[PDB]
Design a protein around this nucleic acid. Structure first.
Lengths: 204, 120, 257
RNA sequence: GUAGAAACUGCGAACGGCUCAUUAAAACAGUUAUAGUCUACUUGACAUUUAUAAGGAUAACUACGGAAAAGCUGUAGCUAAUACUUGCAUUAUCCUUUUGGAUAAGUAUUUGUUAGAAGGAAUUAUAACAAAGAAGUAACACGUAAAGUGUGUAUCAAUCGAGUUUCUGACCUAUCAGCUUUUGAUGUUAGGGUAUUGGCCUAACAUGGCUAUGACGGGUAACGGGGAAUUAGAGUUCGAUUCCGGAGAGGGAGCCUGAGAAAUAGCUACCACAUCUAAGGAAGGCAGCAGGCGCGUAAAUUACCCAAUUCUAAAGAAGAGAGGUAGUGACAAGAAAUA
């Protein structure tokens, strides 16, 4: 009923509230990930195609992609399952869940638009919100700006004044750490050699 | 008033910048003498220009009066007192004020605060 | 579950720790380390109940936080660190050195030690292994592994391990004239010259030890420690010099003062 | 630079506390073995077949939501990490004989063929040859002498432990005399399984194994011991209960994570109870500390604090009904008014 439509390209989404059953009839019996022509909801949506990507049943029990039924089932949930939050390591729990097939039971649907249509939707495709926070890895900054290893990228970080620190730098302390490891290994081999020599000399 | 100090098992403790000893205050036919008087008494005993470097504890007046055993520590300085001594003792001496006295209400509140139930 | 126990009841603590019954319900369980819990003492006890520097566990922690107490010339900051039979603990603030020993009664006592003796610790070898390359390594009572020992060093010998370099300087054998110290027996803390040994096929080996006053006492081979040759000890014994006195003359010479 | 909510990550939650239902050669105690094994933290040794530093993907968060309710969570967008994942010299040996030439290159683990510091005894350590071969050897963070540390890592050793294991030791009962053996009982052989040995399990085979020196049963108002009362000496009775060992978390069973659990203030199911519900569905385990009901002849406060003892942590600084303090307390015990 509360169709949450998402444009990931613009990173913006709109809540469409509908009641008529014939409006959402084309979505019936469409499993998650199905592309469906979002035509019957309204005139403005004519043209776009929507990817069905989730929902919540009448009692609020969410939907999944695995179990291909039209009702609620209960099953064990693992640590890496996508509909469950373990309370402790290795904990498994059995919870009710609603099948991926959509029928006249969903209290909410989550959809994403995949193909642009012919009209425009205010606030759904007009403006867009970017990354909302820049990358932190030096490799990510270097890939985004394409300045290779010419100069330190710390001068070309985006602002909030105040800038996040960058990981995987080329700090002289990093270089010192590598050279310290090298010389430690070298002197270790040297002391090994001399102690082997003294063992050989004291053997007789 | 007239009383005498007696210091036993006095040993220097550079590890805590202290010197540890046991005190018996002999005050025959006289009541217990408060800690201030013994404080300046051992201050002049050890030629100390300051009295707040003193901590005194465990004073027991013994049976029949006229004596009182106890423990005392001098400190190198007020910074040493603050660094190497517990906050209840600091409050008892009076050089700091007591902290908030919520107590185990903190424990009950922390149990009420269940992770990701208060967004803050 | 049934994992490793991590508490030590006060009454269950080792006797030589010498703690009071009413001083709380627990005792400090020594962290695993170079010495057995029974055959060692945590440094919390060492400098709270023996040196009396700290009178609470928290003051023990405050002492340990400053890198001022070193066990075998390396800084240690663990409260429940096992110090073990004989080793040099150096306190830098007071600049004092203690070599840990037993007494004739059988408790752990720090012994005041000068600088030149404080770099010179003894280690009784327990195992001789050989790893890849026919390299031999000694496992000592200190829980220490020493590679490249002289071939003449045997299983029960005792080496002079230098604290800084960690190298052996010379080793002492276990002949019938070697000065020994008993480490865990009924005669723990006694010092003698090993009157004789006898090998029992498949069972404990016994050695009989001669005292200074020609007193013979036997003990198991597993709990003796060579501390020198017939000439003299290689360390400084505490004031009793390892001579256990009988219950009669002990009272007799304690009375006279 | 100083801090820093939340969150990811790490460690702990397997300790502690409570109780004594089960349990009669079982558990436990003394005494062994592990040459039949596993072992986190901690400690000592020490390593092998783009590099001026590699990759995506996610929490927190943002906005749209559902459900009466819960440690419920759906979709879209980013970002980190010591989360997850790839990946960069050299050393040793033989010959003239300081030096020049020449030769070789996998840690555990498994298989086959051999040689062989210690143990009491080795199919031991170790070494040689022929095959495989994990996992690693720092793409990580802070700073000590007037270069250190932290975190992480292969193997060995130590340590904290554990699992099995030898011998010996227990109350009443014969109105319990023969038990066990298809359905493993006793043993052999081969295997599977385990961390390891083992009928632990499987297959084949043999007919064994225990017993009046009490097997097998039955009873126990039976957890075992250290111990307690009474004791001249013997004895008799008690030991739920400070410590140690065992077992259990309403009764059974099963399982994940983990070094360690058949864990229960972890999960799954059944039985018996029992809570909320909008009736659709959710949630539970006081033999932890208080406290309540019931049962009874029979037993305390819904108190205070982490200051002491000690444990956990990313380890001064936080927590801890462990523990300590007080309250109730003619359980016991000691001193001692009423001249």
């Amino acid at each position: 009923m509360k169709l949450n439509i998402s444009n990931p390209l613009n990173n913006v989404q709109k809540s469409i509230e509908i009641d008529d059953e014939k409006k959402l009839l084309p979505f019936m019996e469409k499993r998650i990930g199905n592309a469906v022509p979002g035509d019957s909801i309204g005139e403005e949506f004519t043209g776009y195609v929507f990817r069905i990507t989730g929902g919540n049943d009448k009692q609020g029990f969410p939907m999944i992609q695995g179990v291909l039924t039209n009702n609620r089932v209960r099953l064990l949930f693992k640590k890496g399952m996508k509909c469950y939050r373990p309370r402790k390591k290795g904990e498994r729990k059995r919870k009710s869940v609603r099948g991926c097939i959509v029928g006249q039971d969903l209290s909410a649907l989550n959809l994403t638009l995949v193909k642009k249509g012919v009209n425009e939707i205010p606030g759904l495709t007009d403006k867009a919100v970017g990354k909302k926070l820049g990358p932190k890895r030096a490799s990510k900054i270097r890939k985004l700006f394409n300045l290779d290893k010419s100069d330190d990228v710390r001068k070309y970080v985006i602002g909030r004044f105040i800038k996040p620190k960058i990981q995987r730098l080329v700090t002289e302390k990093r270089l010192l750490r590598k050279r310290n490891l090298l010389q430690a290994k070298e002197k270790r081999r040297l002391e090994k050699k001399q102690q082997l020599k003294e063992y050989k000399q004291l053997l007789n | 008033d007239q009383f005498t100090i007696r210091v036993k098992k006095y040993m220097s403790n550079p590890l805590l910048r202290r010197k540890q000893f046991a005190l018996e205050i002999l005050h025959p036919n006289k009541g217990s003498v408060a800690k201030k008087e013994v404080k300046e008494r051992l201050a002049k005993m050890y030629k100390l220009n300051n009295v707040n470097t003193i901590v005194l504890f465990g004073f027991k007046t013994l049976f029949g009066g006229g004596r009182t055993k106890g423990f005392g520590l001098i400190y190198k300085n007020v910074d040493a007192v603050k660094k190497f001594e517990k906050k209840y003792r600091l409050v008892r001496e009076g050089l700091i004020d007591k902290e908030t006295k919520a107590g185990r209400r903190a424990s009950k509140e922390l149990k009420n605060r269940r992770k990701k139930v208060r967004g803050t | 579950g049934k994992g490793i126990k991590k508490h030590l009841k006060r009454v269950n603590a080792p006797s030589h720790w010498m703690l009071n019954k009413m001083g709380g319900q627990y005792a400090p369980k020594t962290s695993s380390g170079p010495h057995k819990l029974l055959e060692s003492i945590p440094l919390v006890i060492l400098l709270r109940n023996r040196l009396k520097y700290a009178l609470t566990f928290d003051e023990v922690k405050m002492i340990l936080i400053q890198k001022i107490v070193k066990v075998d010339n390396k800084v240690r900051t663990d409260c429940t660190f096992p110090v073990g039979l004989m080793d040099v603990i150096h306190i830098t603030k007071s600049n004092e050195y203690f070599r840990l020993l037993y007494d004739i009664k059988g408790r752990f006592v720090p012994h005041r030690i000068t600088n030149e003796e404080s770099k010179y610790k003894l280690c009784k070898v327990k195992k001789i292994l050989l790893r890849k390359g026919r390299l031999s390594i000694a496992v000592t009572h200190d829980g220490r592994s020493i590679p490249y020992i002289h071939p003449d060093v045997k299983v029960n010998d005792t080496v002079r391990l230098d604290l800084e370099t960690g190298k052996v300087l010379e080793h002492l054998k276990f002949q019938v004239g070697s000065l020994v110290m008993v480490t865990a027996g009924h005669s723990v803390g006694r010092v003698g010259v090993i009157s004789s040994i006898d090998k029992n096929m498949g069972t404990y080996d016994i050695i009989h030890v001669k005292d200074s006053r020609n007193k013979v006492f036997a003990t198991r081979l597993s709990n003796v420690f060579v501390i020198g040759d017939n000439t003299k000890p290689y360390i400084s014994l505490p004031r009793e010099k390892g001579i256990k006195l009988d219950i009669i003359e002990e009272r007799r010479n304690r009375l006279k003062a």
